[PDB]
Design a protein around this ligand. Structure first.
Ligand SMILES: NC(N)NCCC[C@@H](NC(=O)[C@H](CSCc1ccccc1)NC(=O)Cc1ccc(-c2ccccc2)cc1)C(=O)N[C@@H](Cc1ccc(O)cc1)C(=O)NCCc1ccccc1
Length: 215
């Protein structure tokens, strides 16, 4: 695999979004991954609707602003036969009634792949598939106060992850890190991104729950 990868360079990633005070990170992580896969398949980058996922993927196991999984989101899209665009189905940061409209569907998937729980495997996926959905332990104030540099939290857990984010690449500094897209707005961290310790024994469990939708 390459020494470094940054899918933002090839137009696979939309601008940073903000989930607000709602446990919908799994939804933003899911749309981020689909946005990347739909781009590789059609050459068109279209911001997807997290709200659509929040209001309708309950049957698949998601709990709106109370949490969920990226995989459940992917499963919903497959079951649903589509997913509305961010433009047609705006984000409200609160659970509402399902308002899915197939006429505005701009994305779709035929399932998902769960990556082996190894950083080595996550690297291959990132290098050969595009942005990957992952979960990390972001429950420390060090993460809340993150501004710049390679994020390393000594008290991080590789077992219990509580924040779904998006890996858009990886690299090293002149020391290795994963390029992670968060959904807390562009004012947090590095323009909404965070460089997290890579090859430091699955730091914060970044490779424990990795996956992506198949298009
Ligand atoms: N321990 C487990 N697991 N608990 C479940 C967690 C539920 C849900 N995730 C959240 O609620 C996240 C937790 S972030 C860390 C934090 C921990 C403590 C205090 C405070 C902050 N909240 C947010 O991002 C909200 C948010 C917080 C802060 C600012 C912000 C930004 C700048 C300045 C000031 C404030 C802006 C926005 C969630 O569903 N997370 C998923 C992540 C995941 C994990 C594995 C995976 O494979 C995919 C996704 C999850 O844990 N899912 C497993 C649980 C589940 C399953 C089905 C249905 C419901 C819940």
């Amino acid at each position: 695999a390459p020494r470094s990868v940054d899918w933002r360079e090839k137009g696979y990633v939309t601008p940073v979004k903000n989930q607000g005070q709602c446990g919908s990170c799994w939804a933003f992580s899911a749309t981020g991954a689909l946005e990347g896969q739909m781009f590789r398949k059609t050459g068109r980058l279209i911001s997807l609707s997290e709200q659509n996922l929040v209001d309708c993927s309950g049957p698949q196991g998601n709990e709106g602003c109370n949490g969920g999984l990226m995989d459940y989101a992917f499963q919903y899209v497959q079951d649903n036969g589509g997913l509305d665009s961010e433009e047609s189905y705006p984000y409200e940061a609160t659970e509402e009634s399902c308002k899915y409209n197939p006429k505005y569907s701009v994305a779709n998937d035929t399932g998902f792949v769960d990556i082996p729980k190894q950083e080595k495997a996550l690297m291959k996926a990132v290098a050969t598939v595009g942005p990957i959905s992952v979960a990390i332990d972001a429950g420390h104030e060090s993460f809340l106060f993150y501004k710049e540099g390679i994020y390393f939290e000594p008290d991080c857990s590789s077992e219990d992850m509580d924040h779904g984010v998006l890996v858009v690449g990886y690299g090293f500094e002149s020391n290795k890190y994963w390029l992670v897209k968060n959904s807390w707005g562009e004012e947090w961290g590095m323009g909404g991104y965070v460089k997290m310790a890579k090859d430091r024994r699955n730091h914060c469990g970044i490779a424990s729950a990795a996956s992506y939708p198949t298009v």
